[PDB]
Amino acid sequence: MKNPQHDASLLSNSNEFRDKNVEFFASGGTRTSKFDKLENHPFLGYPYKRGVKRVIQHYEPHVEAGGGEDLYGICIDIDEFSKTATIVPITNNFEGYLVAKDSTVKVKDKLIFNKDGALEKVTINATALTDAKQISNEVYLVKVAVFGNKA
Amino acid sequence: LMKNPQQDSGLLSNSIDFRDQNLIFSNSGGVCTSSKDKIENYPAKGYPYKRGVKLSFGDGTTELEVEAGGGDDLYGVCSDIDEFSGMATVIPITNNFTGYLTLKKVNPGDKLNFNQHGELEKVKSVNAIALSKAHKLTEDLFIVLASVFGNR
Amino acid sequence: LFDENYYAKAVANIIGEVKDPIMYKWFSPDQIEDVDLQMGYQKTVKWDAFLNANPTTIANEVNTISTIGFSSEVVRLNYLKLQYKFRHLKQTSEKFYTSDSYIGDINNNLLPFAQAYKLASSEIIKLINHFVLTGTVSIQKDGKNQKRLLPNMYGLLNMPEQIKEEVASGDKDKMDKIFEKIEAGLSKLELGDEFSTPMMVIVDPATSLKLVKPYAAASSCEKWEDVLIQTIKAINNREDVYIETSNLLKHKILIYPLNSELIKFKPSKYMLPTPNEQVDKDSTDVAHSYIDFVLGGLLATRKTILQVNIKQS
Amino acid sequence: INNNLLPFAQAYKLASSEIIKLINHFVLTGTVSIQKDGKNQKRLLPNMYGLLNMPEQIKEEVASGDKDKMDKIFEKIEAGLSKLELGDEFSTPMMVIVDPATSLKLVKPYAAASSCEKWEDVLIQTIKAINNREDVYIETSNLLKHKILIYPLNSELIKFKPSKYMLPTPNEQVDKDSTDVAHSYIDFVLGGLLATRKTILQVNIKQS
Amino acid sequence: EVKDPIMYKWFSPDQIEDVDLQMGYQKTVKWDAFLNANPTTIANEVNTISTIGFSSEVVRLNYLKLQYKFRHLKQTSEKFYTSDSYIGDINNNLLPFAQAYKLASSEIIKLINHFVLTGTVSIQKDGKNQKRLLPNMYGLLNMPEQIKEEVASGDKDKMDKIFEKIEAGLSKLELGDEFSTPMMVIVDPATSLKLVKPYAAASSCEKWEDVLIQTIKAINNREDVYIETSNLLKHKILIYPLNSELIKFKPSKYMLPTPNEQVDKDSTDVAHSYIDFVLGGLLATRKTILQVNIKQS
Amino acid sequence: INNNLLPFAQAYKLASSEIIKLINHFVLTGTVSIQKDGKNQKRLLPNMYGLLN
Amino acid sequence: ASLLDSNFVPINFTEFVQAISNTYKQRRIQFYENLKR
Amino acid sequence: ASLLDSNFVPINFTEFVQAISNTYKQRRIQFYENLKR
Amino acid sequence: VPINFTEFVQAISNTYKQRRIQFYENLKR
């Protein structure tokens, strides 16, 4: 979901400072600017840390996990109670840990968002900064820099 | 698929009518209960609530459990569940039970049998007689008042 | 605080001129109670009992008896926090826009902070009243493009598990047909032991116009309004019946009791508009301010509201 | 909350309230059932009757076409009132029990419409004609369904002799076990309505 | 007249605190911080700065209520079964209530001690047919995210290999800022017999027990090191600190056996009674427990 | 808890502790890195050495 | 603490907001007291 | 000999039931006394 | 003197706690 550490059975050992940030609860970006535009949109499904597209149908338009030519932005945080998602518009650049389709993504690889909002090797939307890292059975996170859409 | 509905209602209930108030899914136990009934409890494998159960054996490391089933493996009827401990309350087939049980998606007096999933179905090896028509709680969830009094 | 912050002082000196919401007329003093919350939920528990079978006759010896079952329901009220932003003139720039009779730029629709805040608060209060009435939030007359809200957030018109009546398109002009539907809904109401309470009716202007026609050969001393009052008094144990007209409604009639034991409004104590401390400033004369408000908190029992709709086909 | 278990005091209060509702329903309608349709009735003993199923009383049936015609309903009521036989107990208060729909119909102006004169007032005057101008009370009960019940309030004609243990009473037997769940029992007694024949008028509005 | 549980010797007085609960759960929250990237060099104008992230972890401890039933002689019927020196029916194995309750309580306390040590509930010697328990219910031996070392079957007798594995585990331990604490070691009788041999040509006045104590003192800031022998263990070595900040025991105040108020009386002379006890309540920080298993297969 | 937000005092204390650990690591090793592998090191200036490098 | 008192000197924005809420509550109480149906 | 009074101390379940019946009767009597039609 | 079974159970628990405290006081490693 969002926080997988609220079902833990042991206390964490808070001594080491290395290799402690590549997790699924790490909301936001590794480097954040004060002048980054953040939007709140109602969402359907679970688009957290994924590319999001805007869907219009009566109710206001919502956002859901997607990519391709419908790519509207990237979801970086979610409020479950209000069922809202914080979105960085595709017109704004972003660096952070996003979901990848599999573990075949390597450094210096050009990445595209797919229908599920996951990054995959090859328009071009991002460039991988680290290797794909396994957090859960199917959860693969990769540090990546997004620079809009470029052919 | 839960005795206690997860989605809590947005309105208060109106306690003005005394009829047709027991036709809910959270009505655990039986309509007619004897003080000399034999009541067991077992670890639950899945959600066998309001269904006929059978004894399932694991590798051997863990103890036996109960899972929804019927046929010649029928051991008893699951009347209640404690979700915190995963404990299913069972009434053995050697004891007779009268209550609301899950029906497979039937008129008072029709003979019934337990299928592979612990659901009552219209007919061989179990004495189940329907005492009411099928009441639909959900588009796929149907209950029926049945009296079980052993095997045939 | 007033020495340092000027906008806070302006709000303090202009807050009195904001008119009270009209939704206060739709409720009684005991029917409204504030809750200390901004965004979240409040939960209550209600217990109920029921009969499982016919009672058992105690003859000779028997140990198999019919059972009485119990159940619990959890009622949850969701409160949501919303915000609006408005542009105004910076405090130090007012002298350069003061005119003979007014202050501000008519060419650019820029106002001083006090006037801008007053108008914005009035508009937000109108939106809040509309939400409390109809259960929806929208800015279009069609009512489309609504804002997706949380569950357990309802108004007097969209509250579920209530009595709903519909008057056909061909019978829209027929006040007798409308009154027939109203009587049917009134009979289907279930007040219970809380019947000796005043009742409230909310109607649209067209229905208010129709209500003053003579009762139908035509009568000579009694009218449709009097007939409706007598009909409602038949069920409220001859208690007060109040009639109100709201321009928000269109071809709809709402009937409900003013009893705190059946319908209660528990709004957040921060529901009405409140200024935000953050002010956006730049090198120009235009600044931006923010207003916060909270929505949610209407609790009603089942089958205690009559909602009559008149189809306009 | 998760297992629907209450303290004994609250459980007993709720059970007693439900049982009292059942007792009131039996006293009115003459039957015992937990279904809204009224089927699967509990087989009771003979000589056990309520105010609605008492035999040898005056019965009228308003037809389907006149289900909303208050004039026809009042005509049937007048015929039943004429057929009533009070005899020497005329000077007694009368009681009328009405369903909510007919109660709402009663408050309409009497029919051109007569000012300061309602169908309720007309009915009260009509009943006062035969009760020697005594008090006529009107009650509305949701238990009834399109039924009007008219009967006097004189003990010489209709009497209620219930058991002194009719209302719910706790039992001494409490089932106990090694767990935290216990069981208790509540007793109540039914029966005891005695009315002379042809002293109750029952008007049924026949829908469909 | 009932002996104290042996699990008390495995904990310090400050490491145990009672909780008022029979069945349910307790939960606690811990807050952590982390660095998401390398720092940012402040030079000229820059707006994008590296961020420090935060996290919350909720740890839940479950408790379970269990019951046993035993038969005994009725109080009024005792006099027809007593004798000059033997009390109770020898042929039918019937005892008075006091003796039956004492023996049953002793058995239940043995079961509780075994659960606290190994985190399992079973009555078979093989250890199979275990009672299924709730999640977040662990003992000192099955606690996850700890240090686990395994000595091979061929080296089941080589104390040098056993000590090498123990040393590797001690190095992998992460006591951290709570290192200045006494340490506790639990071993089986075979391991205790092995520990008295001279250290290895054989040394003089240097034994494996002394070497192990010195090795543990190297990491515990020269604090006290205690060694206990438990016949419950078998081919297992357990090492952990006696610090409340790392390992704590919050048992239910009704954990130890308690008689029930229900007695099953009848017309005959046989009655039945019930005993209740509560299981659960061990809290441990990760990577603070060393478990060494000596394989034989 | 659901959104992982803290008061300023606790947030500052935790961040200061992490930064102090990083400073100790740099003083000992001469490098700045947030990984246990030691890769993706921050580029530094010359004449900036630790006890190990 | 209400904005209807001329002897009220707020210290900070939190107190200002609390005073605004109290003023709203007192205004609704006054409205219901002055209401005549 | 009714549950309404506080001086009443039942000795057994039979007297308790008799007190319950007396309380029901007294409540009915008081209801009819206070009834206004 | 325990008036009721609840007091009896509380006394049993307090006795267990006191025995634990006394055992730790008398313990010498």
Tell me how far CA of residue F41 lies from CA of F37, F52, F53, in angstroms: 10, 15, 14
* Of B3, B104, B12, nearest in space to B44 by CA: B3
- Under an 8 A CB cutoff, do E48 and A33 touch? yes
Q: Is B20 on the interface with E (CB under 8 A)?
A: no
Question: A81 touching C, CB under 8 A?
Answer: yes
Cross-chain CB nearest to H17 (options D135, D137, D169): D169
**H/E segment holding residue E129:** none
d(CA C273, CA C260): 25
Q: Using CB atoms, which residue from G15, G20, G35 is nearest to C15?
A: G20
CA distance D88 to chain B (A): 41
Report chain A residues whose CB lies below 8 A from the CB of C144.
58
Touching partners of B (3+ C-beta pairs < 8 Å):
C, D, E
CA distance C171 to A111: 63
**Is F51 touching A (CB cutoff 8 A)?**
no
Tokens describing residue C85: 């932003």
Contact E112, E4 (CB under 8 A): no
Q: Does E174 touch chain I if contact means CB atoms closer than 8 Å?
A: no
Residues C145 and A59 sit within 8 Å (Cβ to Cβ)? yes
- Count CB neighbours of E136 within 10 A: 21
Helix axes C175-188, C224-235, angle to 10 degrees: 10
Q: Which residue is associated with the tokens 């092995």? A: E194
Mutate to test the interface with E, among F12, F14, F20 (most CBs of E within 10 A): F14
Instruction: Please list the alpha-helical segments (H only) found in E121-257.
Output: 159-172, 189-194, 208-219
User: Do D and A share at least 3 CB pairs under 8 Å?
Assistant: no
- The CA-atom distances, in angstroms, between A67 and each of A60, D11, E257 are 20, 57, 61
Pairing mode, if any, of strands C306-310 and C163-167?
parallel
- Among C74, C154, C299, beta carbon nearest to B8: C74
Searching chain B, which residue's CA lies closest to the CA of residue D1? Answer: B4
Q: Which residue on chain D is closest to H26 by alpha carbon?
A: D164
How far does the CA of residue C79 sit from the closest CA of chain A (Å)? Answer: 10
Cα gap C281→C288, rounded to integer Å: 7
DSSP labels for A42-53?
EBSS--TTSEEE
Using the Cβ of E124 and the Cβ atoms of chain B, whether some distance falls under 8 Å is answered with: no
B118 to chain E, closest Cα gap in Å: 23
Give the chain A residue nearest E32 (alpha carbons): A14
User: C58: exposed, middle or buried (C-beta count within 10 Å: 0-12, 13-18, 19+)?
Assistant: exposed
Query: Could you say which of C16, C20, C277 has the minimum Cβ distance to residue G28?
Result: C20
Specify whether the CB–CB gap between D146 and D204 falls below 8 A.
yes
Question: Hey, are the CB atoms on I17 and E18 less than 8 Å from each other?
Answer: yes
Burial (Cβ within 10 Å: 0-12, 13-18, ≥19) of residue E37: buried
Cα separation, G1 vs B53, whole angstroms: 65
Residue among F6, F32, F40 minimizing CB distance to E31: F6
Question: Where do we find the tokens 């004449």?
Answer: F47
For chain I, say whether E16 makes contact (Cβ under 8 Å).
Answer: yes
Distance linking the first and last C-alpha atoms of chain G: 31
How far is CA E267 from each of CA C91, C121, E76, E88, F41, rounded to the nearest angstrom? 96, 82, 12, 18, 85
Q: Which long-range contacts (CB under 8 A, 24 or more apart) does D176-179 make?
A: D176/E262, D177/E262, D178/E67, D178/E69, D178/E260, D178/E262, D178/E274
Sort H12 into a burial class: Cβ within 10 Å, 0-12 / 13-18 / 19+. exposed
Nearest to D142 by CA among C306, C198, C187, C231: C187
- How close is the nearest chain A Cα to the Cα of F18, in Å? 6
Cβ-Cβ contacts under 8 Å for E232 (sequence gap 6 or more): E113, E114, E117, E118
Place of tokens 């996850």: E144
**Nearest alpha-carbon partner for C307 in C194, C181, C127, C138:** C181
Of F2, F25, F36, the CB nearest to A3: F2
Query: d(Cα C228, Cα C222) in Å, to the nearest integer?
Result: 10
Inter-chain contacts counted by CB atoms under 8 A, chains D and H: 11
What's the CA gap between D92 and E48, in Å, rounded?
94
Q: How many helices (H) and strands (E) does chain I have?
A: 1, 0
DSSP summary character for residue B120: E
Partners of E247 in beta bridges: E284
H34: Cβ contacts below 8 Å, ≥ 6 apart: none
Q: Which of F2, F25, F35 has the CB atom closest to A19's CB atom? A: F35
Q: Does C302 touch chain A (CB under 8 A)?
A: no
Chain D residues with CB inside 8 Å of E67's CB?
A: 178
Q: Is D176 on the interface with E (CB under 8 A)?
A: yes
E225-229 vs E183-187, strand pairing mode: parallel
Cβ–Cβ contact E22 with D under 8 A: no
Q: How many CB pairs under 8 A join C and G?
A: 45
In whole angstroms, how far apart are CA A54 and each of A41, A87, A94, C63? 9, 11, 19, 65
The residue type found at H4 is L
Q: Are C231 and D107 within 8 A, CB to CB?
A: yes
What residue in E sits closest to B57 (Cα-Cα)?
E129
Residue with tokens 């690889």: A109
> Could you tell me which residues are beta bridge partners of residue E292?
E149, E237
Smallest CA–CA distance from E13 into chain I, residue: I24
Task: Tell me the three state secondary structure of residue A89.
Answer: strand
Nearby residues of C300 by Cβ (< 8 Å), 6 or more positions away: B11, B12, C154, C156, C159, C162, C256, C262, C263, C264
Pair type for strands C199-203 and C241-245: parallel
How far are the Cα atoms of C193, C207, E187 from residue C236, in angstroms, in the given order?
11, 22, 81
- CA-nearest of A111, A138, A141 to A123 is A111
What's the alpha-carbon Rg for chain A, to the nearest Å? 15
Angle between helical axes of C6-14 and C113-134 (0-180°, round to 10): 60
Q: Is E296 on the interface with B (CB under 8 A)?
A: no
Q: Are strands A133-134 and A140-150 parallel, antiparallel or unpaired?
A: antiparallel
Chain G residues with CB under 8 Å of C32 CB are 28
C66: distance to nearest CA of chain B, Å?
5
With CA atoms as reference, the chain E residue closest to A11 would be: E285
Q: Is C221 on the interface with D (CB under 8 A)?
A: yes
Please identify which residue in the block is written with the tokens 């159940």.
C71
Neighbours of chain I (3+ CB pairs under 8 A): E
Instruction: Establish if F34 touches chain A: CB-CB under 8 angstroms.
Output: yes
Cβ <8 Å between G17 and C2: no
Q: Which residue has the tokens 């926080």?
A: A3
Q: Which residues of E touch B85 (CB under 8 A)?
A: 23, 64, 134
DSSP D65-103: TTTT-HHHHHHHHHHHHHH---GGG-SS-EEEEE-HHHH
Which method resolved this structure?
cryo-EM
CB contact under 8 A, E258 and I13: yes
CB pairs under 8 A between B and E: 22
E67–D contact, CB cutoff 8 A: yes
Q: Give the DSSP letter string of D11-45.
A: HHHHHHHHHHHHHHHHHHHS---SSTT--S---PP
Distances (CA, A) of E67 to D178, E7, H35: 9, 21, 57
**Contacts of residue D86, Cβ cutoff 8 Å, sequence gap at least 6:** D92, D130, D131, D152, D157, D199
Nearest to D176 among E67, E69, E262 (CB): E262
CB spacing of E254 vs I17 below 8 angstroms: no
Please list the residues that pair with B112 across neighbouring strands: B122, B128
Nearest to D55 by CA among D203, D205, D198: D198
E252, E63 contact by CB (below 8 A): yes
Scan residues 116-135 of C and list those with Cβ closer than 8 Å to A.
Answer: none
State residue E193 phi and psi, 5-degree precision.
-65, -40
Which residues are CB-contacts of E5 (< 8 A; sequence separation ≥ 6)? E109, E112, E113, E256
Contact H20 D169 (CB under 8 A): yes
Sign of CA dihedral B67, B70, B72, B75: positive
* Nearest chain B CA: its distance from D170 CA (Å): 17
**CB neighbours (10 Å) of residue C95?**
8
Residues 6+ apart with CB under 8 A from C133: C23, C26, C155, C156, C157, C202, C246, C248, C249
Q: Which of B50, B44, B42 is nearest to B78 (CA)?
A: B50
Is the Cβ of C227 closer than 8 Å to some Cβ of chain G? no
In degrees, rounded to 5, the angle at the alpha carbon of residue A139 between the alpha carbons of residues A135 and A142 is 80
Least CB–CB distance from D165: residue in H13, H21, H37: H21
End-to-end, the C-alpha distance of chain C in Å comes to 58
